Amino acid sequence: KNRPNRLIVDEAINEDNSVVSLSQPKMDELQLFRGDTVLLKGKKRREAVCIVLSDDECSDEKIRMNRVVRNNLRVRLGDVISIQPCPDVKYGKRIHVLPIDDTVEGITGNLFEVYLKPYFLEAYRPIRKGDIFLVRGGMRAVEFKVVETDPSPYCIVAPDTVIHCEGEPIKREDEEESLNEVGYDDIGGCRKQLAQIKEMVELPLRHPALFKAIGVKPPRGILLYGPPGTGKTLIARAVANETGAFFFLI
Amino acid sequence: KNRPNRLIVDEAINEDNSVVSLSQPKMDELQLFRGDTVLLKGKKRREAVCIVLSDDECSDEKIRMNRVVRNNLRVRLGDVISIQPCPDVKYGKRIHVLPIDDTVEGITGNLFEVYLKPYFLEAYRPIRKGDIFLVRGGMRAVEFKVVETDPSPYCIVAPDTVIHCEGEPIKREDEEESLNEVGYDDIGGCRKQLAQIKEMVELPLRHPALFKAIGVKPPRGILLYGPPGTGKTLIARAVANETGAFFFLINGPEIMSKLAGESESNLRKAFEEAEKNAPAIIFIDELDAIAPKREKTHGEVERRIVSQLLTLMDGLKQRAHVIVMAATNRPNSIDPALRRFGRFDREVDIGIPDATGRLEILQIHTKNMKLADDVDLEQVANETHGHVGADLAALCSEAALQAIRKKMDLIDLEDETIDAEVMNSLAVTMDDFRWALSQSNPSALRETVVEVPQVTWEDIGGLEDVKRELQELVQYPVEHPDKFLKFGMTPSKGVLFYGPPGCGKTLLAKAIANECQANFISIKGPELLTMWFGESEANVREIFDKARQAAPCVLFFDELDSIAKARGGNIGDGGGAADRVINQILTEMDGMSTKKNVFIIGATNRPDIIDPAILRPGRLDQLIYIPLPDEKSRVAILKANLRKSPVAKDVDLEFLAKMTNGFSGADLTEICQRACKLAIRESIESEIRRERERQTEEDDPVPEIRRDHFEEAMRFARRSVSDNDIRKYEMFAQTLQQSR
Ligand SMILES: Nc1ncnc2c1ncn2[C@@H]1O[C@H](COP(=O)(O)OP(=O)(O)O)[C@@H](O)[C@H]1O
Numbered sequence: 006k007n008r009p010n011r012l013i014v015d016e017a018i019n020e021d022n023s024v025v026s027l028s029q030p031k032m033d034e035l036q037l038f039r040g041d042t043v044l045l046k047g048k049k050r051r052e053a054v055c056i057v058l059s060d061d062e063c064s065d066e067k068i069r070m071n072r073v074v075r076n077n078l079r080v081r082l083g084d085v086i087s088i089q090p091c092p093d094v095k096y097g098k099r100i101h102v103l104p105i106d107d108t109v110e111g112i113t114g115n116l117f118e119v120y121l122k123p124y125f126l127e128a129y130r131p132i133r134k135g136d137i138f139l140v141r142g143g144m145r146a147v148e149f150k151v152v153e154t155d156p157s158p159y160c161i162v163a164p165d166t167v168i169h170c171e172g173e174p175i176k177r178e179d180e181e182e183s184l185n186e187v188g189y190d191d192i193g194g195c196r197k198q199l200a201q202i203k204e205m206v207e208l209p210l211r212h213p214a215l216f217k218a219i220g221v222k223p224p225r226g227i228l229l230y231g232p233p234g235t236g237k238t239l240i241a242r243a244v245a246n247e248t249g250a251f252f253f254l255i
Numbered sequence: 256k257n258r259p260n261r262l263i264v265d266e267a268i269n270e271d272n273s274v275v276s277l278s279q280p281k282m283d284e285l286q287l288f289r290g291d292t293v294l295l296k297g298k299k300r301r302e303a304v305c306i307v308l309s310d311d312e313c314s315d316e317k318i319r320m321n322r323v324v325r326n327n328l329r330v331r332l333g334d335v336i337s338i339q340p341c342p343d344v345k346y347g348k349r350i351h352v353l354p355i356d357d358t359v360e361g362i363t364g365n366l367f368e369v370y371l372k373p374y375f376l377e378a379y380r381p382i383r384k385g386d387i388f389l390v391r392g393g394m395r396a397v398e399f400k401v402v403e404t405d406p407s408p409y410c411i412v413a414p415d416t417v418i419h420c421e422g423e424p425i426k427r428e429d430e431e432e433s434l435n436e437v438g439y440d441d442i443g444g445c446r447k448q449l450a451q452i453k454e455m456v457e458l459p460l461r462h463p464a465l466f467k468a469i470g471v472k473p474p475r476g477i478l479l480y481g482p483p484g485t486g487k488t489l490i491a492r493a494v495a496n497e498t499g500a501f502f503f504l505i506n507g508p509e510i511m512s513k514l515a516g517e518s519e520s521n522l523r524k525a526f527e528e529a530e531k532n533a534p535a536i537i538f539i540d541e542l543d544a545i546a547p548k549r550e551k552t553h554g555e556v557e558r559r560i561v562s563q564l565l566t567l568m569d570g571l572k573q574r575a576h577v578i579v580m581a582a583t584n585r586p587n588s589i590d591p592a593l594r595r596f597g598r599f600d601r602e603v604d605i606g607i608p609d610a611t612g613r614l615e616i617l618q619i620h621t622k623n624m625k626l627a628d629d630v631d632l633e634q635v636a637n638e639t640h641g642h643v644g645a646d647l648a649a650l651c652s653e654a655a656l657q658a659i660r661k662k663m664d665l666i667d668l669e670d671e672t673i674d675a676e677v678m679n680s681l682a683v684t685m686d687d688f689r690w691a692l693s694q695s696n697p698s699a700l701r702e703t704v705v706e707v708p709q710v711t712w713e714d715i716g717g718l719e720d721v722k723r724e725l726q727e728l729v730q731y732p733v734e735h736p737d738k739f740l741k742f743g744m745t746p747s748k749g750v751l752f753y754g755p756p757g758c759g760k761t762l763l764a765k766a767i768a769n770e771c772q773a774n775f776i777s778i779k780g781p782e783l784l785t786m787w788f789g790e791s792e793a794n795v796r797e798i799f800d801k802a803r804q805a806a807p808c809v810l811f812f813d814e815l816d817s818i819a820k821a822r823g824g825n826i827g828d829g830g831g832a833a834d835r836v837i838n839q840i841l842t843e844m845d846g847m848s849t850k851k852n853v854f855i856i857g858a859t860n861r862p863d864i865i866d867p868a869i870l871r872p873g874r875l876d877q878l879i880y881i882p883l884p885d886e887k888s889r890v891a892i893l894k895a896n897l898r899k900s901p902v903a904k905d906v907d908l909e910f911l912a913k914m915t916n917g918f919s920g921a922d923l924t925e926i927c928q929r930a931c932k933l934a935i936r937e938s939i940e941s942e943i944r945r946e947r948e949r950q951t952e953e954d955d956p957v958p959e960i961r962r963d964h965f966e967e968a969m970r971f972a973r974r975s976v977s978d979n980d981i982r983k984y985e986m987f988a989q990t991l992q993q994s995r
């Protein structure tokens with residue numbers, strides 16, 4: 006559009022899995038409110054709906070996004086997104102959601118009572134078709150994909166609104182990378198070395214054609230070290246998953 | 256034509272890529288002017304047009320030519336050229352130039368706007384058909400070939416004249432060697448070893464039929480060495496490209512990876528290939544991987560390949576001008592059977608670069624990076640002690656990547672795709688280099704540095720007679736050998752400075768090593784102690800080996816009494832003054848060459864406990880006593896220390912020298928450093944107080960180190976030598992010089 010409405014995505018710090026946090030300036034400047042719901046459009050015509058918060062630390066051009074919704078938009082870390090305000094709360098009536106067969110196997114139990122009951126309890130969670138969300142509990146982290154929403158194609162669940170959980174779990178799609186995979190959110194005690202590794206492998210992997218178009222030396226060999234079981238292979242797979250580059254393991 | 260109009264080409268020093276510089280004499284003598292354009296005819300009926308300049312250093316028969324125009328004439332380095340005057344400026348009208356597809360690929364952008372616009376801006380550049388020129392920018396160096404010129408066949412572009420850049424890039428020709436290849440212009444910090452290598456491989460490669468027509472021994476094996484990533488393979492390819500000799504490259508691990516018997520086939524066939532395409536140069540990279548020492552070889556498969564290499568080296572030296580240059584990290588890490596004559600007889604020590612060399616390396620790698628204006632590579636080159644060429648190359652690339660990473664990638668990430676525009680606009684600030692050099696590069700070497708120290712004679716206050724004696728002892732045997740031979744005297748090869756600590760012994764060593772422009776090797780106390788404790792005195796040999804490899808030199812052992820006082824002082828250990836290390840110093844000093852221009856200097860602030868078997872003739876025998884300064888010298892010391900720091904004008908140094916009596920030369924530096932500390936504290940505190948201004952950002956107060964700052968720095972003055980030590984030195988002098 007070439008006018009300022011696009012933002013750069015980055016890591017998140019909040020424990021809520023269905024919100025996006027933006028800086029107090031960009032909040033007033035984008036003509037938005039605290040708590041107001043919006044649409045986040047990313048790549049491959051896949052948008053979503055989210056809630057906005059305020060965070061002093063995050064900068065203006067930067068937007069906190071946790072891995073679940075960041076993966077939902079089909080975008081990956083370090084890319085650009087378009088935020089559009091939508092105060093059009095089309096309060097839901099019934100949801101048709103089913104789990105995935107891959108994440109749900111052996112799990113003897115009425116999943117409705119055990120997982121979603123405190124999950125959607127007094128939860129004003131907005132949902133749109135094509136959103137694979139997740140909820141944790143019982144030494145498990147279960148994935149749920151919504152197929153059929155009463156308010157088409159998006160809604161917001163009210164505390165009164167029912168949730169309708171009939172059906173068999175569905176086989177996973179070819180264009181969502183599952184969330185049992187590793188990401189930067191998992192690596193706890195190495196947030197400083199992760200800065201170095203991200204700044205080293207950001208440009209060669211995210212922007213490959215750039216180094217084709219420039220005479221400059223890229224970093225080729227990286228030697229991670231440290232005592233065993235510290236998280237080296239973890240960091241490798243995490244970087245591979247976040248930048249989306251193919252990962253061979255020798 | 257057999258009359259003087261032909262010249263010898265050689266290297267260039269100017270940064271302009273379309274001119275030739277000639278000596279002021281040959282200028283008047285050839286009937287030419289300064290700036291006048293001429294024709295340069297070379298081989299294969301390919302001439303060019305150029306501009307002439309004046310340069311005092313270049314000699315009469317020699318002509319500065321940079322690699323682009325030198326390659327344009329189809330000639331190579333060391334050949335002869337014909338210069339003809341042509342004041343016929345046939346001022347151009349339109350040019351038809353197109354790039355090469357090889358150099359131009361991926362380069363999204365209007366090349367006309369990004370490269371040629373400031374290139375030909377007010378540029379009176381002469382052009383002729385068949386000229387492939389180049390222009391640098393945007394982390395690229397782009398080649399342009401002219402096909403069709405309005406004034407036929409040559410012209411000169413005026414600032415008014417248009418340049419017409421239509422068409423697709425053309426595929427490169429078979430008889431121009433592309434300029435991404437390496438040449439002598441690229442190698443920065445090895446301009447001295449390059450002289451040796453060029454004089455060694457000039458005649459066998461440039462003039463091959465001459466050695467066929469003469470019975471004389473050619474150099475066959477050359478062993479380049481030095482720490483990794485210093486530029487060995489670079490020098491090899493550079494020599495190969497400049498002399499135009501075929502270059503075969505043998506990689507150590509590559510050959511050593513193949514199966515048993517496949518590797519020897521590869522070596523044999525490689526030598527055959529190089530023999531077939533003579534003149535040739537074989538480069539056996541990482542020789543210490545193929546042929547290590549016999550102790551580290553075990554198993555037939557290794558020794559067999561070493562033997563095969565030996566046999567091939569011995570065989571090649573029958574009627575076959577193939578020079579074999581091999582590279583290794585350390586020379587005493589490879590098989591000693593190789594360094595015997597006929598196989599590897601010439602040895603070259605590349606060594607780590609120095610300050611001027613590092614600055615040159617930086618200029619080489621920032622050649623097309625579009626630096627910012629605040630970039631002062633002097634500071635950088637002064638802060639890169641420990642870096643080799645690979646380190647500096649990676650530093651420049653990392654600074655470039657940081658400049659791409661901060662802005663101009665994420666900023667134009669959302670609006671518009673990649674383009675050449677942003678590449679031109681990237682100015683890499685001095686802060687960026689400060690960051691890249693700050694933490695993100697571990698300097699990859701901590702060896703003994705060999706260089707010509709930057710200390711000069713005015714950096715030292717007082718000690719004039721010691722200066723004339725040092726000049727006499729170091730200079731006269733090299734500058735007037737005939738007097739020494741006539742009078743039969745033998746030139747001494749050693750001095751022993753002695754006196755209070757911190758008075759200028761190391762300063763004098765560096766100064767006299769600088770005045771003669773000879774290398775300097777410092778061997779401090781901790782090193783001798785490390786060789787004594789570790790019980791490895793057999794490293795002393797290696798030290799002297801360096802002094803031989805870098806002749807002329809000044810080998811400087813300071814704190815020579817360190818071992819002598821480590822095992823107790825005057826009484827100390829029950830033994831005598833003979834040590835494990837000092838004995839090796841005696842052995843190596845007695846057994847050096849007759850005159851190899853290596854001048855050993857010692858230093859000791861306790862001359863009574865030094866091993867008296869080193870003060871005997873044939874060894875360090877000139878005892879020079881560095882005394883405590885006087886007022887007329889302390890003034891000079893204070894001036895020489897303070898001349899780098901901005902100091903006020905009302906401060907009287909003569910009063911300081913009056914009050915600071917018997918202060919050793921180090922105390923007069925501690926005073927200045929402490930006063931500078933006080934001034935810096937005041938500056939930062941005033942800065943913070945002016946930052947408490949929140950009522951309204953203004954210029955910092957006058958930073959002249961002022962008086963009444965020394966009045967505080969002087970409060971904490973210490974004398975680092977008692978009168979008792981002065982008395983001891985006095986007694987030493989009195990007894991040893993006057994007793995009987
Ligand atoms: N920094 C870390 N952050 C999160 N989990 C970790 C970390 N380090 C270790 N772990 C846990 O221990 C496992 C071991 O990690 P791994 O990459 O196999 O260690 P290494 O490769 O160093 O032997 C991880 O899979 C994870 O379960």
Ligand SMILES: Nc1ncnc2c1ncn2[C@@H]1O[C@H](COP(=O)(O)OP(=O)(O)O)[C@@H](O)[C@H]1O
Nearest residue numbers: 441442443483484485486487488489644645648
């Ligand atoms: N003396 C030098 N002059 C210019 N560039 C150098 C020099 N030394 C190293 N470099 C840079 O680092 C690279 C390493 O050179 P290389 O010949 O591979 O080192 P070595 O063979 O000693 O391991 C060169 O290609 C160049 O990019």
Ligand SMILES: Nc1ncnc2c1ncn2[C@@H]1O[C@H](COP(=O)(O)OP(=O)(O)O)[C@@H](O)[C@H]1O
Nearest residue numbers: 714715716756757758759760761762892920921
């Ligand atoms: N005569 C002098 N002239 C100039 N500077 C001196 C003089 N004497 C000592 N210094 C200062 O003392 C410092 C250390 O002196 P140094 O020569 O290392 O002592 P030593 O002679 O014991 O090796 C040097 O940085 C130098 O600036």
